[PDB]
Design an enzyme around this catalytic site. Structure first.
Site, PDB file in Angstrom:
ATOM      1  N   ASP A   1      28.429   0.117 -36.678  1.00 46.74           N
ATOM      2  CA  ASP A   1      27.791   0.971 -35.680  1.00 46.74           C
ATOM      3  C   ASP A   1      28.662   1.105 -34.431  1.00 46.74           C
ATOM      4  O   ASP A   1      28.153   1.329 -33.322  1.00 46.74           O
ATOM      5  CB  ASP A   1      26.414   0.395 -35.311  1.00 46.74           C
ATOM      6  CG  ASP A   1      25.572   0.080 -36.535  1.00 46.74           C
ATOM      7  OD1 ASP A   1      25.406   0.986 -37.374  1.00 46.74           O
ATOM      8  OD2 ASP A   1      25.084  -1.062 -36.666  1.00 46.74           O
TER       9      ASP A   1
ATOM     10  N   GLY B   1      30.999   3.434 -34.013  1.00 46.40           N
ATOM     11  CA  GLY B   1      31.194   4.841 -33.731  1.00 46.40           C
ATOM     12  C   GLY B   1      32.357   5.401 -34.532  1.00 46.40           C
ATOM     13  O   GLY B   1      33.038   6.319 -34.080  1.00 46.40           O
TER      14      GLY B   1
ATOM     15  N   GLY C   1      24.519   5.416 -43.994  1.00 43.48           N
ATOM     16  CA  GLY C   1      24.489   6.858 -43.818  1.00 43.48           C
ATOM     17  C   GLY C   1      25.334   7.417 -42.686  1.00 43.48           C
ATOM     18  O   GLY C   1      25.680   6.710 -41.737  1.00 43.48           O
ATOM     19  N   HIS C   2      25.674   8.697 -42.791  1.00 47.00           N
ATOM     20  CA  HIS C   2      26.465   9.362 -41.763  1.00 47.00           C
ATOM     21  C   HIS C   2      26.028  10.807 -41.562  1.00 47.00           C
ATOM     22  O   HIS C   2      26.033  11.603 -42.501  1.00 47.00           O
ATOM     23  CB  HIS C   2      27.949   9.325 -42.115  1.00 47.00           C
ATOM     24  CG  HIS C   2      28.803  10.134 -41.188  1.00 47.00           C
ATOM     25  ND1 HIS C   2      28.672  10.075 -39.818  1.00 47.00           N
ATOM     26  CD2 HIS C   2      29.802  11.015 -41.435  1.00 47.00           C
ATOM     27  CE1 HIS C   2      29.556  10.885 -39.258  1.00 47.00           C
ATOM     28  NE2 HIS C   2      30.254  11.466 -40.217  1.00 47.00           N
TER      29      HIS C   2
ATOM     30  N   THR D   1      28.842  -7.441 -46.613  1.00 49.09           N
ATOM     31  CA  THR D   1      28.689  -6.602 -47.794  1.00 49.09           C
ATOM     32  C   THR D   1      29.495  -7.244 -48.914  1.00 49.09           C
ATOM     33  O   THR D   1      30.119  -8.287 -48.710  1.00 49.09           O
ATOM     34  CB  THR D   1      29.209  -5.163 -47.550  1.00 49.09           C
ATOM     35  OG1 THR D   1      30.620  -5.193 -47.300  1.00 49.09           O
ATOM     36  CG2 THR D   1      28.497  -4.537 -46.358  1.00 49.09           C
TER      37      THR D   1
ATOM     38  N   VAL E   1      18.615   4.057 -37.687  1.00 49.52           N
ATOM     39  CA  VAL E   1      18.276   5.474 -37.747  1.00 49.52           C
ATOM     40  C   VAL E   1      16.997   5.752 -38.539  1.00 49.52           C
ATOM     41  O   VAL E   1      16.188   6.601 -38.148  1.00 49.52           O
ATOM     42  CB  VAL E   1      19.419   6.284 -38.382  1.00 49.52           C
ATOM     43  CG1 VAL E   1      19.770   5.697 -39.746  1.00 49.52           C
ATOM     44  CG2 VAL E   1      19.008   7.750 -38.511  1.00 49.52           C
ATOM     45  N   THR E   2      16.813   5.033 -39.643  1.00 53.18           N
ATOM     46  CA  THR E   2      15.635   5.226 -40.479  1.00 53.18           C
ATOM     47  C   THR E   2      14.460   4.309 -40.120  1.00 53.18           C
ATOM     48  O   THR E   2      13.389   4.786 -39.747  1.00 53.18           O
ATOM     49  CB  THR E   2      15.995   5.046 -41.977  1.00 53.18           C
ATOM     50  OG1 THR E   2      16.433   3.701 -42.216  1.00 53.18           O
ATOM     51  CG2 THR E   2      17.115   6.009 -42.369  1.00 53.18           C
TER      52      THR E   2
ATOM     53  N   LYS F   1      28.205  11.342 -26.951  1.00 58.49           N
ATOM     54  CA  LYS F   1      28.002  11.683 -28.357  1.00 58.49           C
ATOM     55  C   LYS F   1      28.808  12.901 -28.817  1.00 58.49           C
ATOM     56  O   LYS F   1      29.372  12.895 -29.911  1.00 58.49           O
ATOM     57  CB  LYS F   1      26.514  11.924 -28.631  1.00 58.49           C
ATOM     58  CG  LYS F   1      25.630  10.721 -28.358  1.00 58.49           C
ATOM     59  CD  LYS F   1      24.213  10.950 -28.860  1.00 58.49           C
ATOM     60  CE  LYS F   1      23.544  12.121 -28.137  1.00 58.49           C
ATOM     61  NZ  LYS F   1      23.369  11.874 -26.666  1.00 58.49           N
TER      62      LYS F   1
HETATM   63  N1  LIG Z   1      26.887   7.477 -25.613  1.00 62.00           N
HETATM   64  C1  LIG Z   1      27.764   7.424 -26.637  1.00 62.00           C
HETATM   65  N2  LIG Z   1      27.325   7.448 -27.888  1.00 62.00           N
HETATM   66  C2  LIG Z   1      28.336   7.380 -28.779  1.00 62.00           C
HETATM   67  C3  LIG Z   1      29.692   7.294 -28.538  1.00 62.00           C
HETATM   68  N3  LIG Z   1      30.400   7.243 -29.729  1.00 62.00           N
HETATM   69  C4  LIG Z   1      29.482   7.299 -30.653  1.00 62.00           C
HETATM   70  N4  LIG Z   1      28.209   7.383 -30.143  1.00 62.00           N
HETATM   71  C5  LIG Z   1      26.964   7.437 -30.900  1.00 62.00           C
HETATM   72  O1  LIG Z   1      26.834   6.226 -31.611  1.00 62.00           O
HETATM   73  C6  LIG Z   1      26.106   6.471 -32.841  1.00 62.00           C
HETATM   74  C7  LIG Z   1      26.805   5.820 -34.007  1.00 62.00           C
HETATM   75  O2  LIG Z   1      27.082   6.798 -35.006  1.00 62.00           O
HETATM   76  P1  LIG Z   1      28.461   6.804 -35.801  1.00 62.00           P
HETATM   77  O3  LIG Z   1      29.463   7.455 -34.933  1.00 62.00           O
HETATM   78  O4  LIG Z   1      28.201   7.375 -37.142  1.00 62.00           O
HETATM   79  O5  LIG Z   1      28.818   5.212 -35.910  1.00 62.00           O
HETATM   80  P2  LIG Z   1      29.148   4.367 -37.263  1.00 62.00           P
HETATM   81  O6  LIG Z   1      30.533   3.780 -37.067  1.00 62.00           O
HETATM   82  O7  LIG Z   1      29.085   5.362 -38.409  1.00 62.00           O
HETATM   83  O8  LIG Z   1      28.253   3.121 -37.817  1.00 62.00           O
HETATM   84  P3  LIG Z   1      28.110   2.673 -39.380  1.00 62.00           P
HETATM   85  O9  LIG Z   1      28.847   3.707 -40.216  1.00 62.00           O
HETATM   86  O10 LIG Z   1      26.619   2.669 -39.657  1.00 62.00           O
HETATM   87  O11 LIG Z   1      28.738   1.291 -39.470  1.00 62.00           O
HETATM   88  C8  LIG Z   1      25.956   7.983 -32.966  1.00 62.00           C
HETATM   89  O12 LIG Z   1      24.613   8.391 -32.713  1.00 62.00           O
HETATM   90  C9  LIG Z   1      26.973   8.527 -31.970  1.00 62.00           C
HETATM   91  O13 LIG Z   1      26.617   9.777 -31.423  1.00 62.00           O
HETATM   92  C10 LIG Z   1      30.148   7.273 -27.195  1.00 62.00           C
HETATM   93  O14 LIG Z   1      31.304   7.204 -26.779  1.00 62.00           O
HETATM   94  N5  LIG Z   1      29.091   7.344 -26.296  1.00 62.00           N
END
Ligand SMILES: Nc1nc2c(ncn2[C@@H]2O[C@H](COP(=O)(O)OP(=O)(O)OP(=O)(O)O)[C@@H](O)[C@H]2O)c(=O)[nH]1
Ligand SMILES: Nc1nc2c(ncn2[C@@H]2O[C@H](COP(=O)(O)OP(=O)(O)OP(=O)(O)O)[C@@H](O)[C@H]2O)c(=O)[nH]1
EC number: 6.3.4.4
Lengths: 431, 431
Positions: free
Chosen positions: B17, B19, B44-45, B245, B305-306, B422
């Site tokens: 998580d 990002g 999920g993504h 995992t 998310v879910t 985001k």
């Molecule tokens: N405020 C903010 N939100 C961010 C930033 N980078 C990512 N996000 C949010 O963080 C959340 C994480 O989503 P992903 O970017 O898919 O992160 P992830 O690496 O896929 O996590 P997993 O795949 O589940 O391990 C999303 O809702 C993004 O919009 C950032 O710099 N600032």
């Protein structure tokens, strides 16, 4: 450089028994660290020094060097008794102070006694009544890896931690096994007791494997040697599944078995036998079930060291070789047993596979398909001369030099060593 | 160069998580190939394009690019129904002609229906009556990997080969599972029938994954992107076992999941969240169970998310970060969610762990130990300003620039991207 020292790796390029041990022993001489990153098949290895013969299975061959550190990476599954049983056997033959030159990553998984048992019965069911064979047995490698996959297995670090939490987990584990296997007998308190004894005996040799290797690779320049297990075609992901071991026997396994990044991987040597051998059932495109195969089988002494079972023999197969390179990115080759061919008038080398008439550019993943390929050969003239005495490129006869070039050219990888015998002297370094 | 093209990799540096998806989507734009080398957690993504929201699990995010090839490596375990179920869902939302831009390595293992079942019950036994938790469930990932380890599982290539030999093996497999699990229900002929249907539907997208990637990397220069699964601390070998995992979520997994050598690995980006989060039970050194954690939890929307379950929050922890680098050899970093900290007066950053009074230089492997470490913090002044609008280094306030440098310096890895929101625009590229 921010990278630090890059490890040197020796990998089998075919189905094993290529002669890796000879290449490792030659390199272990001036190595600061000699390690094993993947257990694989835990096949045996014989080493001779000052008139003593040693037999290593889990222990790296380089443990012979009293000036080097022997290291078992996190990717190796370990059976405590087997380890000490191996340490003790060699010790009473000359190996002294080994417990002072051996380091063990605490992230290495443990092969418990019931694993070996669950593995001993699975075979007496899977192929004990007209069934198909697969890999080794009675070692409990597969079962250990299965436990790892389930995140149910136990590691060295767990054993050395709070023994109370370890016992509860061990019991739970053995419990689950007796559930999935009703005919499995486990002396719980007996084994748990023998382990606590093992924990203390091994504790002084355990360290955080990731930190240990990182330090070694980023401190002053060091020479780390990684002796690969088995070979490319015995790789769990890339070998001729299901006839393979349960671990990666390729270059990626170095990274996952030691916890080092790709930039810390330097020379990767592919050990290529001048002809092909394989153990057990399975597709073998260039197999020679005739007088040639008997000859390669005899001159190469291709039979199990313990069981004496003969190994299948065939012509060099470049499709296997190129495949192995796609996966391993060999930087140099070690062509071994060239001398076995000293006697032939002409030598065949498989150069490609045809499928239903057409030439395919890849090495087939499935057995059924691999069993159907048609091999395209390239007949080469032999040197018909004794090369066992050669000690330099100029000593090799013209047709033998050509045989070497043929391998280099079609693989796109230079040959750095040419093996013409068993003695370490019977090795020619081309550059 | 004989090496050919080097792949670009994006890996999570903490507990997930972080990002990664944002970094991948940004890079998938001009990539010729977008791939997945390890299934991991199949988390999920979500991706948004031209007013449509897509949800990918097994499918690489880059499948959005109609000008790129989407590739699932041999290291990913695949559930046929889940795949088509995922393909169909997104297709009916905009994703068109996906079956023409998706390639699948034939060496990828298959997650059958009973695997998911054996996984659904194991949890309703392991932690259904006051038991400890571990990883995901109902996905049958672990069980599939267990079958792989046992060389008993089946792969795509097997499914597409002689269906007669496949059926016999499938039955044998399901049989063994019903033996180890008596309460397991398997509609053999029902599933075997649904598979034959799946075989034909998937056949046009299958290829020899090793040859496919080798060609792509050695033909004319290409841009290959590998989106890493989960994160470093969720790595089967290197993560906080047993809370991880069943697959390598680190750089080595790229090699073993795609069958490419280390020299074909180029940029490896570590995605680092400006603070730490973790899902589920387990040691969490910098966890903040107070107003700070609530604040990070809320401003960062740290919840499933879910399920909506809140994630544990804590201060940035450099011990985790350095560890992740030892293993992955990050060439650059992506520091995300810096904006979440816009509101704090002072920010703490864990710089080292103390154990029984003494400072240890490594990240502990065992949970019991990791739970006992004492964190040493470094308090830093906050910028107390809104950075969501920043679009370049000069826009960031002095204390925020210092926060970035603090991360670079103590990790020894330059920060290439700074996330302040985001939207894809909310990303600052430093070089
Ligand atoms: N405020 C903010 N939100 C961010 C930033 N980078 C990512 N996000 C949010 O963080 C959340 C994480 O989503 P992903 O970017 O898919 O992160 P992830 O690496 O896929 O996590 P997993 O795949 O589940 O391990 C999303 O809702 C993004 O919009 C950032 O710099 N600032
Ligand atoms: N004649 C001859 N024999 C050789 C040569 N190289 C190795 N051998 C022999 O081949 C045998 C194979 O032993 P190793 O060198 O341990 O081979 P291996 O790679 O360990 O095989 P595994 O570890 O079981 O996969 C030994 O008995 C060697 O002496 C060579 O160039 N010529």
């Amino acid at each position: 450089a921010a990278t630090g020292s890059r490890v040197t790796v020796v990998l089998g390029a075919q189905w094993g028994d290529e002669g890796k041990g000879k290449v490792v022993d030659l390199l272990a001489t001036d190595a600061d660290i000699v390690s094993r990153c993947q257990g694989g098949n835990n096949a045996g290895h014989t080493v001779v020094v000052d008139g003593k013969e040693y037999d290593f299975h889990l222990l790296p061959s380089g443990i012979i060097n009293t000036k080097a550190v022997s290291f078992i990476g996190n990717g190796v599954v370990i059976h405590l008794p087997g380890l000490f049983e191996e340490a003790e056997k060699n010790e009473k033959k000359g190996l002294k102070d080994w417990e002072k030159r051996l380091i063990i990553s605490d992230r290495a998984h443990l092969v418990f006694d019931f694993h070996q048992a669950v593995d001993g019965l699975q075979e007496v069911q899977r192929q004990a009544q007209e069934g198909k064979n697969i890999g080794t047995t009675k070692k409990g490698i597969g079962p250990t890896y299965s436990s790892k996959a389930a995140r149910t297995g136990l590691r060295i670090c767990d054993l050395l931690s709070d023994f109370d939490e370890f016992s509860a987990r061990f019991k739970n584990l053995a419990h689950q096994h007796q559930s999935m296997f009703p005919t499995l007998e486990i002396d719980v308190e007996g084994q748990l007791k023998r382990l606590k004894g093992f924990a203390e005996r091994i504790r002084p040799m355990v360290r955080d494997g990731v930190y240990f290797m990182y330090e070694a690779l980023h401190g002053p320049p060091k020479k780390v040697l990684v002796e690969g297990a088995n070979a490319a075609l015995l790789d769990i992901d890339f070998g001729t599944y299901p006839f393979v071991t349960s671990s990666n026997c390729t270059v990626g396994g170095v990274c996952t078995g030691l916890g080092i990044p790709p930039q810390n991987i330097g020379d990767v040597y592919g050990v290529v036998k001048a002809y092909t051998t394989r153990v057990g059932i399975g597709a073998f495109p260039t197999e020679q079930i005739n007088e040639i195969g008997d000859l390669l089988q005899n001159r190469g002494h291709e039979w199990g060291v313990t069981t004496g079972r003969k190994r299948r023999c065939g012509w060099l197969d470049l499709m296997i070789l190129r495949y192995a390179h796609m996966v391993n990115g060999f930087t140099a080759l070690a062509l071994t047993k060239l001398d076995i061919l000293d006697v032939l008038s002409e030598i065949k080398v498989g150069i490609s596979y045809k499928l239903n008439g057409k030439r395919i550019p890849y090495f087939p993943a499935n057995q059924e398909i691999l069993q159907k390929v048609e091999v395209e050969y390239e007949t080469l003239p032999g040197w018909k001369a004794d090369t066992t005495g050669a000690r330099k490129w100029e000593d090799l006869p013209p047709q033998a030099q050509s045989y070497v070039r043929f391998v280099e050219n079609h693989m796109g990888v230079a040959v750095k060593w040419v093996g013409v015998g068993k003695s370490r002297e019977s090795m020619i370094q081309l550059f």
